[PDB]
Homo-oligomer: 250 residues x 6
């Protein structure tokens, strides 16, 4: 293989220059399923790669795994194989009371609560999305009548203390993150996830285009018994949006 | 006056909720002249305010002064007066060799090389522009046929060592900023200016919309004798763009 | 003109090597008025420059605008024109209960809550005043019987959250600055202003002499209806002191 | 399931309180095969868990994924399931010229070049291994006659720029990490990997025991063509060591 | 003398390569007294050096003074004279309720709340002890039946605010250290002392072996009238342990 | 004793409120010999205290030890005993080529290269000397005809890598401090020593007066064989200056 981890040789890619990069292989398969001729290319550790075709152009779909470090390997190796545009879709807990479960969020830029972004640019650099990608995602969302919010996302290297969860083995949060959630809420941050600050920073600092969209599965500000059926629909909607945005970027 | 520095009452604004915020009064008057029924409201220190009408709605134009600190007083006091949308227009030196004098930059987010942004959000929070405002500026640029780049800007608390200039009384640059220019170049940063990291961060973190456009009057990467008429024309082009974008945000 | 912003050509200066640098042009005119042959030299953006003569030697007076960034341009360009000594006068809110309105404060060194100082020296370097300048200011204050306090000042890039004001559009202060005021009070800081950390650091790090004096117009620790007449007298007193100190430095 | 990601109930663990946590499932299965009555419990995303018996006690083996973020979810959720001892086994590139391929490293503590460790303890807290676990790994290494080094490891959120690799799409490394490798070399750091600063810090700071051993598959300081069989044998040796050490901690 | 401060010429040392480095000369004399042929070599400022012999090999004992700076001079100059292994013994206040007065603590690594460690390695590097030294100290403690705890220690440049003591001239603690003690307790830190972060970091970063042991004289978590007699016994026990560990390292 | 380390009761001080704080006891005795009725009060560890009379008022002279940590214990415990004014005298290596051996430095404020100052005030707070004390030291210097420089000093937690010395066991300096000396040189820093950033910050932030003077015994910028008699004479000159300044502060 032409790269170290993903097990992909460049002609495998058939000249593709856009990849969709969700977190896990299950969703890779769902996204491939909305395009033509889906074929599984490789599966090695957390990286599962499919190829498909969209309006006659090849598109790659490749799982990142959880967190910026594995995200950074996937984006780096796809770039080594010629990918220049990256779009992430995920699911997310919102932290604003006006955002509802089933809404869609388009991330303009992220609060860098990760470690990998710093390996690309010092903290003062913005983890900002590419304007074309963001545009395609906002337009795509409107093409299926999604309720959309466009704004900042907080991107944490942890699922638990970095998102100020206390339902843990220790039940406490280190001082730097204690009270962080309410600061991010006051500053209008939409939601937490775990990979965007790494994704956006490494692309924006290296001449790659990236954008990021997510469906809301939980609203942290209001207790509510999760509805598995709403979640599955929300996921399906966010997948269509990412594909439709790719269509507009090809 | 209803505010501490601006010498403005809310009554003066006649219900305006959008401000164009250039740096200097000469530019204030130039922007207002493009619009209908422009009148000077006040001038105290570096803050000069005019009111004008655009498609029949009142709009404020108010100078920030140089740098994040006076910017931060203008923005806060206009917000206190009911402004919720802020558009900055500037003129700038580009640091990328593909960007020419006369091109227009629209800033998606800024490298925080200032101090005042930290008084609003820790450094990990992105200095990012509002999506609607960036969309309107990009559309306005296209509508006059401008050659446009959309991207990251470095926003410095100094004109000289923070922009890595050596043509100074000291002729040197402190260690932290020595070599910085080449780093930002490698990371695709378009240009330097001195107020956007303050404006964008304090707006993004307080639920105010902001965008920023600039005309290129210099290219730091190419020696060339400045053309005083080219610069005037580029200023004209940027001013028209910012008025057109405001038209789309009213 | 010999410099980029101030619009000054060096022979304009007539060999001067000392400048007084207050914030705004109104006060430039007041300070020029206490010396011989005052003549206005230039006015461009927030920088208004006069020249006058004191015991037969030329002195420049030049407004800085609000905040370290514009302060840094003025000091830099005056230095390029041969100024080697800089004295600032301003007005200030004190934060200690033993300091009264109408007292005068002489700043030995400043807490660096600004951004521009870092473009001259890393944060560990002290924003300290020059000993001769400080001496001339303390002696000058005593020559008109002023009640004087000599000590540390906190120098903020913002007027509002950085000075822990809550009477704002957001009515909140970011976590790093929330509770900061009471820390500075406990540590004996006299007052807040907005330019000294930039002024003192850039001069002390570049072989220039600077000093800083201010009249107290407000005491933050005790509510009190401002008396416009006390303020005007205090200002006039602080202007005489700065001039008289310059006399001792020439 | 009793946890959010792992798909495990406490019942599944049959009272296990020690986990071996390698990076990938292939290694999970290889570790479990060394022990008695191994059975697969669950596989979701990058987390694959088997149970097995060692000297008649249940032991869990569960993959972390690449990087501190997914590591941090595995460790937290196993802790929630009653795991109190964690042993990591990895394979690694050494950066010291006295360390050969096939040698074993046991890590006393790690250089924190990751983000997730900060979500547990500020950077001044040591990423240090539990003494009993390090003792058991050193004893286990000696018991198979391994050539062992005991020392500090650098733990990076990236495989590429944080390990100072230039064979990349950008071919460059941000200023902070340029030259870093030589610094760590001078300071005696044995090797790079990507999860130990997270694992050790979050265990050391929450009263969980952790240790870490790795087999050397590369020496970055010596060009040499990789031998695919040497690497397999080194992986075998490291796996045996980690099982033997677990034997001593049960 | 061969060095700048300690007043020692290398042949004085008779080929020794291990030094015990307690804080003060009184204890130097106590430690020398447990070995053969103790002879005082020098006394200059806080550095008092004796030589003695242990199983026929020369050992040096040299006081460090209080705090990392003087500790850093002593270790540096002994290293210039050929010492390669350093063992510190001291006395300490514990901050955990399960540790009793008269227990012994062996430090695996330290929280860096000092300044000197940074002059050897950036903060992310662990202030970790050498594994052999730590082993010899744990084994030595067990050889006299000591109640031992092995773990992390917090190493402060101050005795008072850095250890969160309020019984002071100011009776307050600066914000960064206010509430620090309870964070360190939650994270399982055993005790405070003042030299280990400097000692461990400078040795671990420069190929020197160091270890650190201490007897508990106070337990901060429970008020208790100090018993001078328990303290003296505890000291005598900790001295025997350090000597006995040296025996195992020679 | 009324304090924990110094072995002093308040009674011992006979109402003294000024201390001269040199580094070592030999200098303690030398200072006291200049004054009337000097008597040794106590000696424990690096702290040796004498009392003496100056113009009929009791004055304390007490050694700090090397470095901010032991300095910080001396200053705190003398403050507890009623000392409110502290004057340090040292001997130092200059780093500017205009400063000669035998010159006297008076420090207006210090570059904080230590750890203990942070335990009193964050790094943005200036390590600045009290104006009265600096005035008295400058006056005392002039009164004996000393060649004096008044300015910034760099205060390091180490004698070796923090002063950028390479004549060491490692012969190297960590990245952060490599090149630092030249930076401080460019920024006009006069000299290095090891206690002033601690002393000045902790005094300035707690309402205690402090000043600092030093005699130059080396010029790092000029190779020259040290003259043992020149150094003794320079020490004499500095001691006389500090006693004269104390005379003016009583
Ligand atoms: K992962
Ligand atoms: K300004
Ligand atoms: K000491």
């Amino acid at each position: 293989s032409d790269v170290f981890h993903l097990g992909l040789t460049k002609n495998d890619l058939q000249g593709a220059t856009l990849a969709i990069v969700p977190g896990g292989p299950d969703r890779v398969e769902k996204i491939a399923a909305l395009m033509d001729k889906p074929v599984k290319l490789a599966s090695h550790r957390e990286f599962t790669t499919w190829r498909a075709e969209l309006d006659g152009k090849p598109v790659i779909v490749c799982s990142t795994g959880i967190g910026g470090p594995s995200t950074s390997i996937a984006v780096e190796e796809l770039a080594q194989l010629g990918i220049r545009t990256f779009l992430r879709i995920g699911t997310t807990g919102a932290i604003q009371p006006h955002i509802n479960v089933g809404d869609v969020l388009v991330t303009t830029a992220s609060v860098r609560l990760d470690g990998a972004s710093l390996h690309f640019a010092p903290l003062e650099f913005p983890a900002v999305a590419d304007f074309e990608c963001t545009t395609a995602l906002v337009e795509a969302a409107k093409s299926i009548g999604a309720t959309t919010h466009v704004g900042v996302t907080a991107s944490s290297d942890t699922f638990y203390p970095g998102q100020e969860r206390y339902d843990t083995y220790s039940g406490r949060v280190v001082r730097h993150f204690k009270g962080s959630m309410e600061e991010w809420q006051a500053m209008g941050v939409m939601n937490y996830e775990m990979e965007s600050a790494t994704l956006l920073t490494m692309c924006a600092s290296q001449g790659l285009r990236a954008g990021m969209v997510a469906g809301v599965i939980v609203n942290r500000t209001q207790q509510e018994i999760p509805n598995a059926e709403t979640m599955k629909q929300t996921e399906s909607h966010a997948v269509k949006i990412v594909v439709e945005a790719a269509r507009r970027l090809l």
